[PDB]
């Protein structure tokens, strides 16, 4: 029993974190086989922040300009190249700790673990979701650039995020590991802002199922609704539309608890229209949307506490 915002164990990723210094700029890199991946911003100059032609900046560089430190061992850079907004630094030593891994790009609404890092040294691990507006609500300070986000599947690390910058609202933007930004953001200090966000409806429903599995049932009711009437109310509360695929994905949870998806939707409708009236769900006084159906199944017992 119990439900927490759980991250993946970070060990496999800790063993790939290195420090990359170019000039007076230091940030984190990801060392996999004989390549170190890091934000290309490492080559940017303090005055170039506004608009840095990275192609020129990289042309002006040589391998010896990149200081790469794996803990106490310096790695010799033997090649450098740019891939969109990340830089690939070939080094003369393959990381003996390289896990099995993949570079995957995730969808808004999916979750992942973040290993926050400073000077190549892991600092903390936490879970979050890719927001509908392609930002993440992370916890990052200066120096965290190059920290990565990931999901672990049978000892295989799927890297999905590299941290690049903080937007004016204090939320965070970055790239996949091919260096392509999530959302309409660029690696220059401009007036870019997050667009309007929405709540991830399928996740809220998954979390309500988690709550039932854990014995919170006060929000349940005898009513059911149709997908369209539900989505009509969702729109009015700035919730993503619920699709039939979401209903299908919630199937297993619906079977475990005996509560049909459209019945749970009627509960969500009431909570949106009425609030929680003094009450909490799984320790929260807000409807939580950063737990996918998969996260719930993985964390929660296969047996419901009836």
């Amino acid at each position: 029993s119990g439900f927490r915002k759980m991250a993946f164990p970070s060990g496999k990723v800790e063993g790939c974190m290195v420090q990359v210094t170019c000039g007076t700029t230091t940030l984190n890199g990801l060392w996999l086989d004989d390549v170190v991946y890091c934000p290309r911003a490492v080559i940017c100059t303090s005055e170039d922040m506004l608009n840095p032609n990275y192609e020129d900046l990289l042309i002006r560089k040589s391998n010896h300009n990149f200081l790469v430190q794996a803990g106490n061992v310096q790695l010799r850079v033997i090649g450098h190249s740019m891939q969109n907004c990340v830089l690939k630094l070939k080094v003369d030593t393959a990381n003996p700790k390289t896990p099995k891994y993949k570079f995957v790009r995730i969808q808004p609404g999916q979750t992942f673990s973040v290993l926050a890092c400073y000077n190549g040294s892991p600092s903390g691990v936490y879970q979050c979701a890719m927001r509908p507006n392609f930002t993440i609500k992370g916890s990052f300070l200066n120096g965290s650039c190059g920290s990565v986000g990931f999901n672990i599947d049978y000892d295989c690390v799927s890297f999905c995020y590299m941290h690049h910058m903080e937007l004016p609202t204090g939320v965070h933007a970055g790239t996949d590991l091919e260096g392509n930004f999530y959302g309409p953001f660029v690696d220059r200090q401009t007036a870019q802002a997050a667009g309007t966000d929405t709540t991830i409806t399928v996740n809220v429903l998954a979390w309500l199922y988690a709550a039932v599995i854990n014995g919170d049932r006060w929000f349940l009711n005898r009513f059911t609704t149709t997908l369209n009437d539900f989505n009509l109310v969702a729109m009015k509360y700035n919730y993503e539309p619920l699709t039939q695929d979401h209903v299908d994905i919630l199937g297993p949870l619906s079977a475990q608890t005996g509560i049909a998806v459209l019945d749970m939707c009627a509960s969500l409708k009431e909570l949106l229209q009425n609030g929680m009236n003094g009450r909490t769900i799984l320790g929260s006084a807000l409807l939580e949307d950063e737990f996918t159906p998969f996260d719930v199944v993985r964390q929660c017992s296969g047996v419901t506490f009836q």
């Binding site: 230091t26 934000p39 000077n119 300070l141 200066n142 690049h164 004016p168 953001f185 690696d187």
Partner: peptide, 9 residues
């Protein structure tokens, strides 16, 4: 007001 690249100097 303006975006912040989070390197370290």
């Amino acid at each position: 007001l303006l975006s912040q690249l989070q390197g370290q100097s």
